[PDB]
Design a protein around this nucleic acid. Sequence first.
RNA 1: GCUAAACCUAGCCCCAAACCCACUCCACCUUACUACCAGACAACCUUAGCCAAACCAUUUACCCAAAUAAAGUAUAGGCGAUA
RNA 2: GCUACCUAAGAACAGCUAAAAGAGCACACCCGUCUAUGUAGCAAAAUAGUGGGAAGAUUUAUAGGUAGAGGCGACAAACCUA
RNA 3: CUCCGCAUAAGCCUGCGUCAGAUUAAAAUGAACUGACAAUUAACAGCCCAAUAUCUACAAUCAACCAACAAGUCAUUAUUACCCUCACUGUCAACCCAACACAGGCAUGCUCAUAAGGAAAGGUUAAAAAAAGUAAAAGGAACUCGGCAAAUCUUACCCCG
Lengths: 97, 124, 26, 41, 181, 152, 205, 46
Amino acid sequence: IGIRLTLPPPKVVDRWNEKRAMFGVYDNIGILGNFEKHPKELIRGPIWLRGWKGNELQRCIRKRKMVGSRMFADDLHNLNKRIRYLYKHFNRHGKFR
Amino acid sequence: GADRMSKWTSKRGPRSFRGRKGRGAKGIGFLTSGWRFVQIKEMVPEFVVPDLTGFKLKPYVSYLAPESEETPLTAAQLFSEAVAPAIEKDFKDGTFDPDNLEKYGFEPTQEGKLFQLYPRNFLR
Amino acid sequence: VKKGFRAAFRFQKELERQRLLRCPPP
Amino acid sequence: LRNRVTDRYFRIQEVLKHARHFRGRKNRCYRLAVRTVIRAF
Amino acid sequence: GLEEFFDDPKNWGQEKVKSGAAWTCQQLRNKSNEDLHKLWYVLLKERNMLLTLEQEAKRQRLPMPSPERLDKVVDSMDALDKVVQEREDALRLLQTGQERARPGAWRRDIFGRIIWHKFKQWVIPWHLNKRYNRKRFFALPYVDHFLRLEREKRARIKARKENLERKKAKILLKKFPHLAE
Amino acid sequence: ARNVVYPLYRLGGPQLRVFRTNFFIQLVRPGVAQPEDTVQFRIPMEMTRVDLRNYLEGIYNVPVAAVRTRVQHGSNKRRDHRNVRIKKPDYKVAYVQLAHGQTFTFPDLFPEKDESPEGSAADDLYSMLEEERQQRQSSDPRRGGVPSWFGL
Amino acid sequence: KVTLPPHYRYGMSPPGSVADKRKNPPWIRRRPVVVEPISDEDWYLFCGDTVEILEGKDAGKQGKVVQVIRQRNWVVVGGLNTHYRYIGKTMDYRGTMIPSEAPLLHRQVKLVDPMDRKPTEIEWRFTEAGERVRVSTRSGRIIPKPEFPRADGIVPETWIDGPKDTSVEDALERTYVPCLKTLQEEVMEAMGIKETRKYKKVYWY
Amino acid sequence: KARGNEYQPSNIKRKNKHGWVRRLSTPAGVQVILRRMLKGRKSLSH
RNA sequence: GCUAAACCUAGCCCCAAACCCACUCCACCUUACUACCAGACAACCUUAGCCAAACCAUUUACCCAAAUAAAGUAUAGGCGAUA
RNA sequence: GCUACCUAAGAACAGCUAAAAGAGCACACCCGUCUAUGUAGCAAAAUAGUGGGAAGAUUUAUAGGUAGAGGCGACAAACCUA
RNA sequence: CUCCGCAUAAGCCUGCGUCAGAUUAAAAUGAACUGACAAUUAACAGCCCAAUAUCUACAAUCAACCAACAAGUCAUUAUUACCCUCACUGUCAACCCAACACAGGCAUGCUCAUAAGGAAAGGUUAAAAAAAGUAAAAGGAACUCGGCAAAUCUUACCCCG
Ligand SMILES: [K+]
Ligand SMILES: [K+]
Ligand SMILES: [K+]
Ligand SMILES: [K+]
Ligand SMILES: [K+]
Ligand SMILES: [Mg+2]
Ligand SMILES: [Mg+2]
Ligand SMILES: [Mg+2]
Ligand SMILES: [Mg+2]
Ligand SMILES: [Mg+2]
Ligand SMILES: [Mg+2]
Ligand SMILES: [Mg+2]
Ligand SMILES: [Mg+2]
Ligand SMILES: [Mg+2]
Ligand SMILES: [Mg+2]
Ligand SMILES: [Mg+2]
Ligand SMILES: [Mg+2]
Ligand SMILES: [Mg+2]
Ligand SMILES: [Mg+2]
Ligand SMILES: [Mg+2]
Ligand SMILES: [Mg+2]
Ligand SMILES: [Mg+2]
Ligand SMILES: [Mg+2]
Ligand SMILES: [Mg+2]
Ligand SMILES: [Mg+2]
Ligand SMILES: [Mg+2]
């Protein structure tokens, strides 16, 4: 019980496909490109996360002021509640002061 | 303990409820004093059934027939078939004017008719 | 179903040993 | 990434193999055998 | 008489009854309205004999001889009703220009959603009717929030549907990798 | 007609007429004993006894003395594998009595003699099965289960 | 009508049959079979068409296509790739053994050229008249759609009009004369009905 | 005394208290039907 | 040896992109889903509190129309908490 | 839709005594004094017996009204869906 | 045995009718469970009414004597308008509210002991303890906080209101 009786299908991986063979290309677009572009501009994803890093409270605060006016009502309400909970935890709870 | 997910019907409720609810049948009269019902002969649908004697058509059609294509009828198709020929003839004759459009078949209004087209006042 | 291969492979080896004990070869 | 223990079967068998010769439910039930295997050692 | 509700006596007990094809909508566009009004009642009487036989087969717990007969008549009755309605619709566009035979209008209900209101026939004008004026065709400002919540609900559904289809296609190349083209 | 709007009537207005009626009735066999003159029908809910009379006299040329109707409830007790109730459609029943002393008896629409086929029927598959079934015989007890195919 | 669950698994037995009901009840939920999407236009295998089996128990054999299932891209050929099953069994009688065919994928068969009985690949084209046809890649020759008996079973060439079957001369006769009147108005003139009373106007709302 | 039989069914009382017409009578009852429409209730009212 | 055990799909999550938004007929604000009769009732108005301040009483962050930086600076505040 | 109070229009109360009765004996009906039983029960307050009232400030069916910073209350801090 | 029973209202909605069954009750005939088929037929009941003005002091109680207070449930006329008439709906059951096939709760009419409706014992044995009853020598509250309970059919007094 809790462990499969047969072996799973083999995990075949192509180490020489397009995405793996061309990974890391254009990471030095600035050094070798006269600094016309910055490597952070090659990052794709959420517009509030491009070239930026923070903790959950910092991520949640940043998302609310950048796309908060476009969010669904239920998702926005939960975001505000998450910011309230995190504000209390980080600023009032912990081992160190 | 009530079934709120069951179809509400005249079979449910007290006596006053069961008599006021119906099943979809159209009325054919009204109730007068004394709970006396008055039937209107003009409110009862009269079936216009034709004579079926010597009628060639039958419920089914033989399979030995061509597979003609479907050409849904359109307003333009009906105008050219019936209205256009009479107009072309009068156009060639040299006597055509909009005032006579009623003579060609056009109906300016629907009032004063037994079978109005909009809003229609007859059954299928 | 849990993802992984090491535990399933290791469990097949114990099954073989169990099978050999129950039915030892000539 | 959700990780789960996939080899918990082998972790408890290295304890129960020392409890096979015990008496009662403490020879097959980990909760009971672990406390008696530790006393044996 | 009541002999038209049943099939030819000789056919009773038979397991198959040969029947022709069903009237097509195009074959009926050549007949006159008077001929179509006569044919409607020829098919009506054949439909009632087939409904009577279908119910007596269940009573006797036996299969109906030729169930396709009923399907053919129903298809002919619908095709004939399509032709007549087609001629009436075209005739209404020429005299009046209306696309609908029954009046109506677009209105907002008390719940704030768009609905097509089909008018009813009355004897008095609408400003005197007690029951019609109790009905509301306008939404108050406490509906706007629910309209958005209901719009966001439809968007979530439509997003899962679009992302699911993309997944199936991406999983459909792993097994058939020759579909790249 | 059903599923249609009825033109409203006022005093002095035209007679209401339906040229094509979509009412479809099915004659049924009574479950319990009924008088000879009485006939039983199943009609749609929207239909009235007044319509059934004019419907029968006009389309089928049948004179009727009396018509009575009742609404029969369909059980909503049946439940599916999801424990959701299944509704048997409610239907209306009509009892019609003939006028001039005519008597109606429901005919036997499935005569056994007619159902039995005088003409020989020779389905290929069935013939194959029947032939083989007959030819093969039960195992002889004395043989003790020894395969019979072997002639040795 | 048709009642098919979302992920209904199509099979050799037709839907709605007693065998399919037992095999596919409303409640079961099975892993969906993956089928290569093929445009109805591109499909080139029809019933009554000779095909050669490439892979299987009996490869290199040519047989007629008796049935095709589009949902699973299956082709059924009579007498080939057939296993054996006892039919008409009972408790006392073992039953009769018969060969039963197994479905073949459209990739495990290959159409044959009528001129040369060899497997060939075909690509659709158009003739002079414009009728679309399938033509072999090698030694291009026309391969018409084999005539197959209709599903219902009616043979037009052997049809006998019955007492409730309209004749061809009465079902094709044209009696309609385009006019500007409805069935209601046109019928009241023929039947002879007259109605002088007028219809008073109503309000619509 | 023994409890549990507080429900004494009456269709009149049921349609007048929690019915469709009384829900729409007040703005708070219209919001009740809107919440049950948003959640997907098969029954919005008695 | 029973009871059981085991599985890989169903679909789902987070982003991106794009604004979004019906229909056969019939029925439905009266007891909704009810063919058919004299009406005139009408919408708007500071959120509070939990909590923090180790009580509590002024006070205690809550997207509000550009990421970064200026800056947790000026400033406010039982000049306390904090803002 | 329980319950507390109220509104509208209804219903029920044998027999005996006295015939005047918020009178007595005493059925139906309403209540629940004492005892035993029951205590995951027949019952999330019951059963048997014994008892109080039973033409009145009585009991009771139906529809309606009062809603929580409140209502209702012959004040038990009662009752307002166990 | 008869705690009732039949019917109406309310509520419920096909929930012991036929056929079939691998389902089911303690019970592999029955069935309230499953599948199919059938079924309640209006005269009872429900569903009513043209307008304007106008009229309506004198209870009920066998309503007659008689006696009351708490002072009561029943009525029209004038003028105008108005010749087609029997539609629609309820009608089943061993049934509702209590999670149950619950010893509970449940309005009215008739029956007032039944012409209707029902079965306390699965079989055996006949220990304790326990429960519900019956009988009991002599004594008769000595019991006990208390004559609780049971039997019987009884006097007087006090406190509180
Ligand atoms: K902290
Ligand atoms: K505190
Ligand atoms: K019921
Ligand atoms: K009880
Ligand atoms: K009896
Ligand atoms: Mg009736
Ligand atoms: Mg504090
Ligand atoms: Mg009550
Ligand atoms: Mg009062
Ligand atoms: Mg008395
Ligand atoms: Mg008294
Ligand atoms: Mg007394
Ligand atoms: Mg009181
Ligand atoms: Mg006190
Ligand atoms: Mg106190
Ligand atoms: Mg009557
Ligand atoms: Mg009855
Ligand atoms: Mg017994
Ligand atoms: Mg016993
Ligand atoms: Mg003893
Ligand atoms: Mg003694
Ligand atoms: Mg003493
Ligand atoms: Mg004494
Ligand atoms: Mg003592
Ligand atoms: Mg005592
Ligand atoms: Mg006192």
